[PDB]
Structures are given as C-alpha cells and as structure tokens.
C-alpha cells in the first residue's frame, strides 16, 4: 500500500559536546539525536524499481547543505515524518536504476558526511562486491558517470597559496586497472583510456575539497595519465601540486571512495574510448550515497 512520494524530510545527527565547530551545532537547532532503535524490516518477495537520477532526496539534502554553507563534516541521518517511510535496496551490485530484489524498510538513512568535493568522492561508502559504474544513460556521453569503488585509496594532503597532496602511486594504479576493466565490460571490450581534463570550469578540471577552513584545488593530471597502466617511475609516492584560495603547517588525510567521470563523444567509430575526471555538480556527491534509498507514502 505504498506509492512514490516526496515529503519534507528531517535530519538526525550524533552531534554532542556543544563544540565550537559550525557543522556540529547546526545539528542541534535543525537536527535531532540519532534513533536509539534503528531497526530495518525486510520485505517478503517484494521487488520494486529505483532511480537515483530522479530522487528528490538529493534536492532536500543539498538545500540543507546550503544552510550550513551559509570545521569537519559529521554524519547525518535523513528520516521521514509519520505517514512516510524509506525503502532501502540491498542488491549489492545494483547500479542505482532498475528493479531491486532485496528491499528493506528503514526509518532513516545511514550516517552520511556532507563532504563537498569535485572529481574525487571522499570519505564515502564503499561498494560491496564489485566496482559499480553508474549513469542515467551510459550510451549518452553527456550524462555523468559515478564510479563506485570497492577499495579506498588514501590521499594525504599537506600545507607547508602553496600546498600538495600525496598518494601511493602503486595502490592507485591497481584500482584504476580494475576501473578500466569494469568499464571495458559495458561497451564491448573496447580500449579504455584515461586523460586529463582540458579547458573548462575550475570544479571540473581540478580536485577541489575542504580542510578545516582550507580550500584546496589539486592538480590530478598525474592521476589520470596512462603512463602508469599496464614499467616506469610510477611506483612510490605521487605528489600532486595544489593551491589555496579565499573565496605554519597542517595535514589532512581522506578516503578516495569514488570518481566522477565524463566520457568523450565523437570517438564513436574508433576502437578506443576516452574518459576524463570531473562531471556533474555537488548534487551528484549526495547521489553517490543516497542511491539505495527512496521515499514512499503509506
């Protein structure tokens, strides 16, 4: 007796200790304590469709993210008022669009950290089982591609306008290998190529992120150059140059758990297929986590 619906969700956090941090107090005036009885309820022999590319939960999140946008991200649970309930998909290798066998009724979503970043998704949830390629329409190269990794790679950023990020080159190459492999499955065993972004918006062409009050804009050219896929001086630590901008020392490490990609058109009659980092906007960062959830009215 459920139908697809949209309702004003409310946030719930584990915010405590009345800190000076802005991200935490915001979860006291606008949010509520986390549910002490977080129980799921499996649906017997129920199969239903999903579509994260039309999920209104993403819009409500963003709007709530903007409010605090007007320091460290903390997990936020999105719940429903009386009369509504959240469905949750547990098909492991579900690409975020289509029928879902393993549906379960949850009261709220898990703890999601509103990490704002571009190109690379940080501190997100990892894909169980295999790597998952996500898109509203893969055949349409204009539609965003969300790569959901199943093994995180640490990025260690340091600030001596000067800054740089350090990544284990050997590990990143292993991951990208499996990314190309999984991409190579969708198209037709075609040659998968990664390339740096050309001219465009600053958000699309460089890895942007925050660090307790520091806005980084890192150069991810070395990360997506096929000099290290398939040896040379690639093993060891890659040092990505970065820069600070105001729109002693300090360090911040993060989990690379996903990648936003854009596939190149035109190259349709060739044997290869090119991809570049950066794509979509901030809403897709939330969409990378809210893919399994969907609201329905009772």
């Amino acid at each position, epitope marked *: 007796v459920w139908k697809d619906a949209d309702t004003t969700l409310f946030c719930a956090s584990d915010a405590k200790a009345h800190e000076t941090e802005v991200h935490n107090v915001w979860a006291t005036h606008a949010c509520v304590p986390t549910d002490p009885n977080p129980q799921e309820i499996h649906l017997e022999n129920v199969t239903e469709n999903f579509n994260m590319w039309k999920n209104n939960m993403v819009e409500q999140m963003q709007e709530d993210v903007i409010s605090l946008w007007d320091f460290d991200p903390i997990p936020i649970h999105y719940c429903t008022p009386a009369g509504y309930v959240i469905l949750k998909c547990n098909d492991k290798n579900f690409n975020g669009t289509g029928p879902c066998k393993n549906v379960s009724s949850v009261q709220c979503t898990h703890g999601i950290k509103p990490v704002v970043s571009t190109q690379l998704l940080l501190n997100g949830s990892l894909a169980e089982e295999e790597i998952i390629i996500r898109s*509203e329409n893969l055949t349409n190269n*204009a539609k965003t591609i969300i790569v959901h990794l199943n093994k995180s790679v640490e990025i260690n950023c340091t600030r001596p306008r000067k800054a740089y990020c350090e990544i284990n080159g050997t590990k990143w190459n292993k991951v990208l290998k499996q990314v190309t492999e999984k991409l190579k499955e969708h198209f037709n065993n075609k040659t998968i190529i990664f390339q740096p*972004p050309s*001219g465009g*918006d*600053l958000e699309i*062409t460089m890895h942007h992120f925050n660090c307790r009050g520091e806005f980084f804009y890192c150069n991810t050219t070395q990360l997506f150059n096929n000099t290290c896929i398939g040896m040379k001086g690639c093993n060891g630590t890659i040092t990505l140059p970065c820069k600070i901008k105001q729109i002693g020392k300090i360090n911040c490490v993060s989990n690379i758990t996903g990648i936003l990609l854009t596939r190149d*058109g035109g190259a349709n009659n060739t044997s290869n297929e090119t991809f570049r980092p950066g794509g979509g*906007n901030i809403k897709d960062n939330w969409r990378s986590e809210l893919y399994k959830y969907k609201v329905v009215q009772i």
Partner: antibody
Amino acid sequence: QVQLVQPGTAMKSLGSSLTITCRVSGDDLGSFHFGTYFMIWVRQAPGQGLEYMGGILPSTKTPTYAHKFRGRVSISAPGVPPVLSLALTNLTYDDTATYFCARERGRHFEPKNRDNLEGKFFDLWGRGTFVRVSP
Amino acid sequence: QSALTQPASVSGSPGQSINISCAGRSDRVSWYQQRPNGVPKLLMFDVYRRPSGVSDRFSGSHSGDTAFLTISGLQTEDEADYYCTSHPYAFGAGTKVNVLR
C-alpha cells in the same frame, strides 16, 4: 558580471612593435585565477571575416597558433590573474585590423537538462582592439 | 584547421525563413552573430544547442557533412554577419544576411 577588457585602439607606425593585452574584470568568483580556460585571439581586417590566429591555456605556458600565424605572432598569459597578451612585431599594413580576445567556454555542466558539455565554443568576447598601421 | 564554405550573402523580407550552410564539418559547429560595428555574439554551439537569451527562431541542423542554421520569421534585428566554426578552430568565410526594409 565577468568581462574581457581590451584597450580599444592602437595607432602604430609601419615597422614598429605592439603588445595587446586582454584582462578579466568583474571576476568576483576567481574563475580565471588558475587559468583553467583556453583563451584565443581573433583578427578581422576592415570589412573582412574573422580569423582564428591561435590561443593559450594559461595553466600551461604553452601557446598554440594557426598555420598562417605560427611564426609571425607571439601569444602568452603571465600574471597572478593571467593577462592574455598578443605581441606583434614589424607591423605591416596587412596587420591593420580589429583584434578580439575570447574565452573557450570549455568543460562545464548544464543543470537544466543535466548535460556534460565539452564547450568547444566562445561565449565570452572582448570589445576588440583596432590596430591602425600608418606610414 | 579545415576550410568551411559559406554563401557570400542571402536576403529575405520580414517574416520569411532562410538558411545558412556550413560546408565540410557538421561536427561541433558554433555560430556567431556580428551586427554592424558590433562584437561577435554566440548564437549556437554543438550544432543545435542555444545559449540562454537566444530566440528559438534560430535553429541548428546537420546533413551528414554540412551544418545548417535556420532563421524562422526573419526580423530587422537579424541583419548581421554570421560566422561558422568547428574544432580544430577555423572560421568560415561568413555570410551577410540582409533583412529588407
């Protein structure tokens, strides 16, 4: 609010040199700060058509030119905010023309339809600098 | 870096419809409108996509090898020089559109 500012006119004598500049203005966001956009120059002699003569991606120190203008012209963009420069040398009467600067929109996202565009076009143009080569 | 051919001139009365061909490259084509003594303005990109502010009277199209620009219901405001380009960049000769008054 963002605009490409050009001087306007340049009266030069035959055989002299000149450097036209194209600076961004009203850049509150700082979108041009890191030189992410490919910037070009375009020539248009009096009563003639537009001529793409080359450009540069300021994040790189590597300019590029059309065949006709490869060895005749020097393009660059140095500065904290990159200021696009076009250096002409030994001016001829054939160099008498209007010189526009323009941005290649480049990669960007279109929300209303949610489409990732390559942006191989020029949305933003300068007013143009008319260079007059006189005897 | 490829030569693109355009007809030198075309004219029409107010209300009529006209065509402007862009011979050679029907891939990633941009159109630019230059009114007299004015700066070139982006009219169309990616063959058929219109920037915000551009009237829907303008329409893009391709025919395999040649791109097209249609102007339905010509108006005096449309009198200008129209330039075509693809990638790699190389502007075509240009076409003068005269709107009879």
